[PDB]
């Protein structure tokens, strides 16, 4: 979706650029509908930082169909030593399905994130558990 050189420039203010670029490429080379975006992230306390996120869709199997489920994964400037902050991003034609892994704001909660530790944990492994969990219980539904 963007070149390795442009990705490196996007994360110029990151503390661990080579590690963040490598883990990001490892996902966007396989998941072509995820794109790195530089945007202003608002922390829960109202402070903000310009961060790279992955925005787009991941393919999720459900009842023999495959959905392009919209997500946003924010990388903190300490990536990969702290987990990404992850959201389901419903379109105007979707609603969030809440449960133990998804709140009404679309924030994702997983053991993978709670137990995050570099280098056991990585961005590709997070996408893989997200696809397994959402295939069991899709986190968004379209209009009836």
């Amino acid at each position: 979706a963007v070149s390795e050189s442009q990705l490196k420039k996007m994360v110029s203010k990151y503390k661990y650029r080579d590690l963040t670029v490598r883990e990001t490429v490892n996902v966007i080379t396989l998941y072509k509908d995820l794109k790195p975006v530089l945007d202003s992230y608002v922390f829960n306390d109202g402070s903000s930082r310009e961060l790279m996120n992955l925005t787009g869709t991941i393919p999720v199997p459900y009842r023999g169909n495959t959905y392009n489920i919209p997500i946003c994964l924010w990388l903190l400037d300490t990536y990969p030593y702290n987990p990404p902050i992850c959201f389901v991003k419903p379109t105007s034609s979707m609603t969030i399905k809440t449960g133990k892994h998804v709140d009404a704001n679309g924030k994702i909660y997983l053991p993978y994130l709670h137990e995050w530790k570099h280098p056991q944990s990585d961005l590709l492994g997070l996408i893989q558990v997200m696809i397994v969990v959402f295939g069991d219980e899709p986190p968004v539904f379209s209009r009836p």
Partner: peptide
């Protein structure tokens, strides 16, 4: 492609 999701039951 475009975002998609299973239709909510009515």
């Amino acid at each position: 492609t475009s975002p998609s999701a299973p239709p909510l039951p009515p």
